[PDB]
Design a protein around this ligand. Sequence first.
Ligand SMILES: Cc1[nH]c2ccccc2c1CC(=O)N[C@@H](Cc1ccccc1)C(=O)N(C)c1ccccc1
Length: 136
Amino acid sequence: PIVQNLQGQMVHQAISPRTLNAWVKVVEEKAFSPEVIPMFSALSEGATPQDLNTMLNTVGGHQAAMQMLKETINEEAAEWDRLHPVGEPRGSDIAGTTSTLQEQIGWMTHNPPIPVGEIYKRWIILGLNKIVRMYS
Ligand SMILES: Cc1[nH]c2ccccc2c1CC(=O)N[C@@H](Cc1ccccc1)C(=O)N(C)c1ccccc1
């Protein structure tokens, strides 16, 4: 996640193994109940796309669900590019596939900012909503 350090520079703090376990624990315990959504949000405060990918990648099994989530992300990335045919970030940059941590932090702190972690979080939550709907 992005944090303000004591200096207060805005910098990246490494994602915690505790956060990753907490995320997998909720997915496994609640079996993609609606409860997964607020938990995903609570665990991803300040997340960069790199952080979010590391979170999502720790979910094992649920291959079909994860594939659906990836397709939702791909669709949102393509829609971003349709509405932003110039400039940076690209949709793939928001999803962290073609961007670096430094690029992500730069966009998040730019003036004006492009909150790429929040945008990606929104896309992921849209994907999670479809999974939740499907598994209900
Ligand atoms: C190699 C592979 N095959 C998959 C099939 C389904 C889901 C994930 C994978 C992967 C790894 C995989 O692609 N994981 C994703 C993160 C991810 C995980 C789970 C769901 C959605 C996004 C990832 O690391 N990146 C860079 C990524 C992010 C957005 C779109 C495409 C790729």
